[PDB]
């Protein structure tokens, strides 16, 4: 294969600044027809990639001029001149001259923005959940930055470990923020054996960890 290497593999862009990804190939991408067949694609989460550039510097229909491509031979460079919030995602370079077709491993682009403390909510289980056999208590951290945060579960005042699962969204396309859900799963026996449920959130944007709680029933 023609091995494609991207650099860096993780690129955090600073607002108001330009950004640059490099892609290097193990062989020349110059074809005998005189053209260079290198392409740049953008992939937002949960959707297929978008064709941005073919033929290192030509733009695909509908792609804005702020995306630019340069390079010769084996060195290629994609620059985002002034970023938008929607521009988070994974960027790939791909050669379309050699078989088998190959792509880079991809560069994950996340934006830098102002810190924001999470909005914290707790969701007690519905009665249907209690009837169902198992119960899930949810603690939600909405719309925070940066990504690092810690959630601790406290039942009747005591720390409870080993029954929780975390899931984090990708950086939002609108306000470039993150959100996190922590789900605590218990039996209804275990759920009704106790009364007070709380999640304590520690995060950089909080002067002190914030606790949200509820009383069973």
Partner 1 sequence: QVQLVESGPGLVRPSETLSLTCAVSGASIRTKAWWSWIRQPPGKGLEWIGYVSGGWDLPNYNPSLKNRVIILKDTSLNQFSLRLTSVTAADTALYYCAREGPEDFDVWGPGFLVTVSSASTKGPSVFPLAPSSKSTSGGTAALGCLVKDYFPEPVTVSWNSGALTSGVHTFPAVLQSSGLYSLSSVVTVPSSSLGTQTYICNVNHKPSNTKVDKKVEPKSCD
Partner 2 sequence: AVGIGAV
- In terms of CB distance, is 18 or 64 closer to partner 1? 64
Among 104, 149, 186, 200, binds partner 1 (CB under 8 A): 104
Residue 149 CB partners (closer than 8 Å, separation 6+): 118, 141, 180, 201, 202, 203, 204
Cross-strand partners of 54: 58
The span from the CA of 88 to the CA of 14, in Å, is 12
Let me know: does 187 contact 133? Beta carbons within 8 Å.
yes
Under rule CB under 8 A, residue 168 binds partner 1: yes
Site string for partner 2, 86-115 (x = CB under 8 A): ----------xxxx-x--------------
Under rule CB under 8 A, residue 30 binds partner 2: no
Tokens read off for 189: 């026996």
Under rule CB under 8 A, residue 2 binds partner 1: no
Mind giving me the DSSP string for 111-152?
E----BPPEEEEEPPPHHHHHHSEEEEEEEEEEEBSS-EEEE
- In terms of CB distance, is 16 or 207 closer to partner 1? 207
48: exposed, middle or buried (C-beta count within 10 Å: 0-12, 13-18, 19+)? exposed
Site string for partner 2, 46-65 (x = CB under 8 A): --------x-----------
If residue 190 lies in a helix (H) or strand (E), which one and from where to where?
helix 188-192
Q: Name the site residues for partner 1 (rule: CB under 8 A).
A: 1, 37, 39, 41, 47-49, 51, 54-55, 58, 60, 92, 94, 96, 99-106, 119-123, 125-126, 128-129, 132, 136, 138, 140, 142-143, 165-169, 174, 179, 181, 183, 185, 212, 214
Q: Name the site residues for partner 2 (rule: CB under 8 A).
A: 31-33, 37, 54, 96-99, 101
């Amino acid at each position: 294969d023609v091995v494609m290497t991207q650099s860096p593999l993780s690129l955090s862009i600073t607002p108001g600044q330009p950004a640059s990804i490099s892609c290097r190939s193990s062989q020349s991408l110059v074809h005998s027809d005189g053209k260079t067949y290198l392409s740049w694609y953008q992939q937002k989460p949960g959707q297929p990639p978008r064709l941005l550039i073919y033929q290192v510097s030509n733009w695909y229909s509908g792609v804005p001029d702020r995306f630019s491509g340069s390079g010769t031979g084996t060195n290629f460079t994609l620059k985002i001149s002034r970023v938008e919030a929607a521009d988070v995602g994974v960027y790939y370079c791909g050669q379309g001259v050699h078989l088998p077709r190959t792509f880079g491993q991809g560069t994950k682009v996340d934006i830098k923005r102002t810190v924001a403390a999470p909005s914290v909510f707790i969701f007690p289980p519905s009665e249907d959940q209690v009837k169902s056999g198992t119960v899930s208590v949810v603690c939600l951290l909405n719309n925070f930055y940066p990504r690092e945060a810690s959630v601790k579960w406290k039942v009747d005042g005591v720390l409870k470990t080993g029954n929780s699962q975390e899931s984090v969204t990708e950086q939002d396309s609108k306000d470039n923020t993150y959100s996190l859900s922590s789900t605590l799963t218990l039996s209804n026996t275990d759920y009704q054996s106790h009364n007070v449920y709380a999640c304590e959130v520690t995060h950089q944007g909080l002067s002190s960890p914030v606790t949200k709680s509820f009383n069973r029933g």
